[model samples]
Target chain A: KNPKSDKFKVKRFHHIEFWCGDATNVARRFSWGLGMRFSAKSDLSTGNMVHASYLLTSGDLRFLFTAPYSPSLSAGEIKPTTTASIPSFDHGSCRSFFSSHGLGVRAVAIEVEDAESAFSISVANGAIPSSPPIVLNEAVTIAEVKLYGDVVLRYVSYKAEFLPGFERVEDASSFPLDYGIRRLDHAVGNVPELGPALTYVAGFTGFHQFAEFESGLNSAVLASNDEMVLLPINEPVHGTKRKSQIQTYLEHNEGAGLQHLALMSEDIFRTLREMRKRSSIGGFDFMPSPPPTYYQNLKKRVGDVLSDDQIKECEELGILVDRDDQGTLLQIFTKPLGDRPTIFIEIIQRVGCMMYQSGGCGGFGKGNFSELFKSIEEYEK
Target chain B: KNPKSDKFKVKRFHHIEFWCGDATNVARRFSWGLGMRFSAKSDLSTGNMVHASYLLTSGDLRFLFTAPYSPSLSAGEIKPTTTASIPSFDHGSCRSFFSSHGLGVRAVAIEVEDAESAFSISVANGAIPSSPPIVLNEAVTIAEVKLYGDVVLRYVSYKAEFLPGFERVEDASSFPLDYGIRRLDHAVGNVPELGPALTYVAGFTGFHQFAEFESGLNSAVLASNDEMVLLPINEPVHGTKRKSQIQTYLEHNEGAGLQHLALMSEDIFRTLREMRKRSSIGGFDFMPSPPPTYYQNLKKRVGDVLSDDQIKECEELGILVDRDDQGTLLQIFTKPLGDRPTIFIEIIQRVGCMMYQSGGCGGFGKGNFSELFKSIEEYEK
Candidate 1:
């Protein structure tokens, strides 16, 4: 739908990579959690750690995890604490080892636009930055994001600036956004305490801090995009963290881990519509299709932001919109891809608003693990 | 080594399935925490719920998570929750929808001798019992051990019977006891409150309970040979629950998920040796291996029990051992297999007695989060 030309441009955001005990354990759990079907597979024969790879998909979101075998082969070995990355607690090797005891989620890999800029932004914003940027000449130039204290984020760019050729090929047939991902929407993480981590992420990472339930992205305007990636990573202070997903992550995942990933979508309505159609196709496993009620609520909640038809479109397209004390944001989430249920992705579109609806992709503060647990119940039945 | 025929019979333990929510979210976070590599490649035309599958590996263990799209197509729908079957807390349209969200262990499956006998023994011991086990013609009959409650334990058996035309595989070479796996060991599950569930499994199943940190199993035991299958799941009471992995699993896995799968080994020494050697192989990503120090300490602690030669065997094999208040156990845990840090397998060998090792495998009932966390720190690093 480009007036300029039929040709499309795919923008690359960042790629995330993680190191852990077992790649397979990590991969399988995410596969089950994300509702994303596998798109590609590979074995990295050239790296210091010869690892396996799996490509994930949910429209346009591409996420992955890598497990390194030996210490010498590990990625992102430089401690973020040493890099002026945010101050964090010691990572429990024994805990992770015993927890894994076999194969489990190890390292995370993310795609970003500017690795160096992202690193600096992450560190300056209060994130714990790790090793200085290292440029690579592989299929994609790579750099690592160390938000310190377990907040691992990355800034990535694909080699092909154009969406044609490999981009199109990589897009499979179902890129969520026709325009491809241009920038990071938001990445949500979980921990035992929220206020502290929230402040840490908000303070260190380029994200702004909003009073709990007070200022989500929808309540703001265009220039507020940078501030939209607020970090609400700790236990909920104001609203509720009771019997929550974060609590479950703390218990099940052993400690703080990623809660969700927010992929950006400019035309949420269109992309959601496409996702809606595909939802029936069964590519998404445990992920619930955006409910019809979501759209009805969207109109009542954010009617002033857009037309009723647009709201209806959001529902029909599978978009979710909600509000907190802050503004309302539109977003969606998937279950963990595989067995351990370690990680997942989010598709988001930050409008000038503050209502954070985490129940869906691309919007909100945190993905609700409790709700997800409910969904799993439904699937089991 | 078996005194019988030189041939060893073994079948692969594919993976254990659990219901979860939000696949995308789970996939990524798991990757970070578990160090798993995601798979973009999948077989779409396979089955209904299996629209996606993530492959994870740790040492010799490879795991996969499959989600059904429609309610009718889900395994959760296959049966209701019961003592034998892990409960499906998140199954059904209006219920919970357990594709990803529900925090519970859906099922535990492994390679075994005979399905009919396993089922028979399971039934005799108080397991709800499986009907019309999955059979792949004359080759093998896969058994399903489904559990109920908020916990879901999905079971799938591999009909590994030998063919009329083909000879059976050697237990050692086929099962490759070298991978630190000798036999199908017990899987410990952590429930919400231990007493009732423990009594239930003990009274109903063939497993016997062991408290006071002494006896056959650390907390419980189930035994079976060619004619039967025995399983004993343990729940922590006071001290054990406070710091044990069972507590961790109870917290992290929601409730009653498999805490660990004990892989039996004839010679822990020789088995571990092979496992370590495999790590150096190309294109292999497993769990974050513990430092050499872990084994060194293990040797010093158990040097009296095991000969120096045996301890050396452990050192070469990357195995660990320890003791408890009453009895001692020799065991080693591998890294996580997938991203969510969901699934794991343990290589265990019972020498004289059965008691949760205080320092072994995080001392089944003695270790706390601090020690566990430290282990992960060194492991990930």
Candidate 2:
């Protein structure tokens, strides 16, 4: 069926919600870092979930971080020494970069016109759809979505599409990068030996095969990149059960889920610094800011791709710059979540980087153990 | 065994981890909200399964978020929109909320010198223990924990014990509300009827039955009100789960996992306003700030018990206040987790409001529904 005539008109990106440990505490930190206002609250009427919601516009999104009152075995002990809390992994020096360069990178939110239609499309696409549209007894029918399986997208079905040409573009931005996003990037998924099954699943979800590559060595082939989200399937590429990162995650995390979201922006350096500032104001920090070598190498290798000035700019701001056959992409990674390290995310701004398989970059099955090791080491310290 | 011994040197609270939907987004938002630095790059070299760890204090106590990148779910239609394209949840987040709050208020994390001792205590106490002590190299050793059905103090064999003597109440400064408190408060369990089962669980976790009261109206009592934790044993104080908040949570959330975390604070007003400010900054609106009536009534009702200034203070901060014959408490709740309206938190600052069942103010449950419904209604707008 032609997606154009699909019942649900894909609108720009909407807000995402997450079940966080403490919304108030997080909101305090987020507000300061993002230079945005936050709404922190606890609703006992609804079983006393502490929630924090942050908003963004134009491919704009709102993130709702909530703390569930339901108890679980996998979840480590609650009632930390303080009030607000969650377990997390390290991303490495992401905060400084965000503070130094990130600015105007607000969380995004969207209002949908057809709640039921949108819900159907999302459900059809294999996305874990929320309950049927509930009018929360409000002006618009709102549907809180589990975006990409991890993020919470709060959508409101309105009379008209929030934005014109809602679909057809890479993402929901002017140049697809107008909203600080350089382009639609990549998502990481772990599908043990179920590569074929996943491929079928992908078809159901509407994702086509991006590229292929070896597991570890020459694992990252940026040149073979595509617009498709790649599932770098790994069984035991890195280490033994006791020493393998993937093994550890699976062993403890209980099962599968989205690994990370890769975002790209043209002005990586500036954006990185702004995010850092927001974190600082919010009274916190982020890990995995791009390494300085990333920029230094940009100047040394693909200096032509970006102006020496730009290279120097990124170097000064601390964004990670890397090049594969597909030019270069500037990027950073976020820490893990809720003490379990089950899921995380990546931010990237690719000038030419497109393929799913990075040309000899980010190993396929093996993944980037070096980066993982570095992250763990930083966290261990 | 004497609770105190030279062999037992109590380290500060280490850390608690949670398995969540998206770690990066959670971390980044936390970093913005808290005030900790996040490390980039996963340190794969350092053992495995260590997806990421964000620290509140280097080597003191930390929160770890993790996930597995294996052959699993492939992003199909959502491919182009993967992390490489759009900013993932945890990716944008990965910001860190370090050890800003000392002994954080009842959330996540705690430093431990001995994991074996904690494990031993847990088994002895009949607490449903997890894995044996696993040493991650030398510096870190972990004792598995199961939440809700467990408590931080359950397995924790505190190296130091609080003597019966008045431990010279430390100045309130020692308990500044804005500490790290980055996790949920306490996880509660229930038996068909609160009796031996409740007591048995309490002993397993070293939790004392702080308080207990029998209601003439057969209301479930908020029996215990310890520092940072509260669990009210119940016996169907009301009819079936029609309006019983406790019954509702019990039915929907499954079993003894998490009940609620007391999101505490020293300067609630300042913190709450900052929460509002931060939400607005994020661009999405949240349930409107708490109404003034919440505060006015609190002062009028609990005037004799809690100071008028204190009561008014809660009102200004959007804090929820309640009481029963046992006592009153200053509390607040947050929005639900996603659409299920399932999980949430309870921000509490207890004065004479010592009755742990203070939640039973209006009725067995839905005591705080009036205010909660109003908040939801506002958000719906």
| lDDT tens readout by residue for model 1, B1-381 | 112210113233444444433233333333333323333223223222322333333344433443322232243534332111112222242123231212223455545556655555555655675343544445555554444334332333443312121223222212111233434445555455656665555443333333223111234433322211334465554463235554544443334556556666666665555554433211123344456556555555567677877766665655555565544566666654333233365667666533432212223423322333455566666
Candidate 1 chain B has its poorest 10 consecutive residues by lDDT at B1-10
Give one clash count per candidate, in the order shown.
259, 231
Tens digits of lDDT, candidate 2, A1-381: 113222344343444333333343344334444333332232333222321222222233234443333233123444332122111211122222122211111112344467656656767766565345654324356554443222233446655322211112122111111224433344444433445434334433343343442223121111111222233333435543445455554444344334544555555665567665443332223564445444444565567777988777765655555555445556666555334444554556656545553332322322233544454555555
- Superposition error at B317 for model 1 (Å): 45
The 0-to-1 C-alpha lDDT of every candidate, in the order given, reads 0.42, 0.39
Kindly report the docking quality category of candidate 2. Answer: incorrect
